[PDB]
Amino acid sequence: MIEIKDKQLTGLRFIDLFAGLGGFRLALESCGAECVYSNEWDKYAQEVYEMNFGEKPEGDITQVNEKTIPDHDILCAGFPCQAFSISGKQKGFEDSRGTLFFDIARIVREKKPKVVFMENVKNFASHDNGNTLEVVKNTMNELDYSFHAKVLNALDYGIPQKRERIYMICFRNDLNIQNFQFPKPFELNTFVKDLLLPDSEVEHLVIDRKDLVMTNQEIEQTTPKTVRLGIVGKGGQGERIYSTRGIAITLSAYGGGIFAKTGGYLVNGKTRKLHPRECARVMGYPDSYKVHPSTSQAYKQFGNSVVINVLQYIAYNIGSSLNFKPY
DNA sequence: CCATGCGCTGAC
DNA sequence: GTCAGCGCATGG
Ligand SMILES: Nc1ncnc2c1ncn2[C@@H]1O[C@H](CSCC[C@H](N)C(=O)O)[C@@H](O)[C@H]1O
Numbered sequence: 377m378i379e380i381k382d383k384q385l386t387g388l389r390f391i392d393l394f395a396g397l398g399g400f401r402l403a404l405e406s407c408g409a410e411c412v413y414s415n416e417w418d419k420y421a422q423e424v425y426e427m428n429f430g431e432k433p434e435g436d437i438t439q440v441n442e443k444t445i446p447d448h449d450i451l452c453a454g455f456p457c458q459a460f461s462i463s464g465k466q467k468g469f470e471d472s473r474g475t476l477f478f479d480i481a482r483i484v485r486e487k488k489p490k491v492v493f494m495e496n497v498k499n500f501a502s503h504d505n506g507n508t509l510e511v512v513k514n515t516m517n518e519l520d521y522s523f524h525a526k527v528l529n530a531l532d533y534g535i536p537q538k539r540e541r542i543y544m545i546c547f548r549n550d551l552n553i554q555n556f557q558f559p560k561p562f563e564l565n566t567f568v569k570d571l572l573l574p575d576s577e578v579e580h581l582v583i584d585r586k587d588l589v590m591t592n593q594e595i596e597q598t599t600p601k602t603v604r605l606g607i608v609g610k611g612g613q614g615e616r617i618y619s620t621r622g623i624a625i626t627l628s629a630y631g632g633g634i635f636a637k638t639g640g641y642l643v644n645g646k647t648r649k650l651h652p653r654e655c656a657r658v659m660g661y662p663d664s665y666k667v668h669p670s671t672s673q674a675y676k677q678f679g680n681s682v683v684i685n686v687l688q689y690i691a692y693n694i695g696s697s698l699n700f701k702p703y
Numbered sequence: 704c705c706a707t708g709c710g711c712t713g714a715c
Numbered sequence: 716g717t718c719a720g721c722g723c724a725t726g727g
Contacts, residue, residue, distance in 0.1 A: 454721085456721090457721050457722095458721080458722065458723095461720065461721070461722065462711095462712065462713060462714095462719085462720050462722090463711090463712085463719090463720040463721090463722040463723090464720090464722040464723070465711095465722085465723080466712085495721095496721090497720090497721060498720090499712095499713075499720085502713080502714095538719085539721085540720095541721085602718095602719085604718080609708075609709095610708085610709085610710095611718095612708070612709055612710070613708095613709075613710090613719085613720075613722085614707075614708085614709095615708085616718090616719085625719075625720085626719080626720060626721075627721075628720075628721060628722070629721055629722080630721090630722055630723075631707095631720090631721095631722070632706085632707050632708065632709070632722085632723085632724095633707065633708075633709085634706090634707065634708085636706075636707070670704095672704080672705060672706090673704095678721095679721055680721050681721075682721090
């Protein structure tokens with residue numbers, strides 16, 4: 377993460393829904409806000425959250441009464457995506473996991489916070505010919521909010537990863553906010569090779585298979601794009617190998633292949649997948665965050681997560697607007 | 704629960 | 716024709 381000297385959100389309160397590792401909390405806390413409620417149902421995720429922040433998040437949101445939730449200023453939610461991703465089937469609103477937005481809508485109707493900050497995958501902006509995005513937009517206008525949405529790629533904000541996502545921000549109409557804007561892009565000066573750990577700390581992650589079909593040469597100069605070097609098996613998901621001189625591919629939660637959930641990379645002559653700490657780093661987490669002791673569950677958590685740096689520049693821009701109240 | 708071979712869809 | 720995805724399905 378980045379350091380913030382000007383703390384634009386000092387007296388505001390917010391809630392962490394679909395908490396996961398607490399990516400939204402780290403970001404909003406560095407700007408000065410305070411957390412008064414958190415929710416998440418996975419046994420193991422609750423263990424890490426507690427290890428780092430000190431509290432246990434409430435369970436299943438579908439059976440919690442919206443009237444018991446504390447008063448607050450900003451609502452945060454990175455809702456589920458299996459039903460909208462380009463890698464899965466595409467059932468959408470007909471999916472048992474695709475109805476979560478309506479619970480946000482339900483909680484929003486009672487507490488009426490000032491800001492709503494949500495995140496989901498790129499294909500959500502294009503799913504069902506745009507009907508899904510419109511249902512979200514119109515439901516939001518009906519509740520008396522304005523709707524701003526956009527797709528930002530992480531390689532444009534300082535992190536070496538090709539993770540594309542849609543961020544949605546909405547302000548209550550009494551406020552009359554007319555100057556909100558998404559952060560501007562800038563040049564990348566850090567690459568995958570600058571986040572890696574020493575060779576000794578790994579060894580056990582190396583893979584020597586006899587399918588290595590080198591199909592390109594190692595490049596000699598850095599570049600902000602994924603550069604493919606070879607294939608294993610049939611070159612399907614998890615059997616593709618990349619150069620440590622470009623950027624990482626999107627980390628995932630339920631992925632497969634011999635180089636599962638992280639992909640494979642050519643390092644000092646050998647091919648291997650990434651370590652949980654290198655996963656923390658390509659996602660913007662600080663070395664002081666404690667990861668779960670089960671490596672298998674650690675990989676699933678970083679893959680469902682959110683990149684801190686981008687949430688930080690966006691949050692700062694929410695506060696600037698709330699603070700511009702001239703006579 | 705953990706490991707790993709797959710096969711289709713979207714935006715060039 | 717090329718290439719990538721906060722995934723799905725099946726075995727122990
Ligand atoms: N019915 C439900 N009630 C409560 N939590 C739920 C839920 N369905 C899914 N979840 C949780 O929703 C999360 C979606 S992914 C969100 C990740 C988070 N932004 C990050 O910083 O890590 C998962 O952790 C999932 O376990």
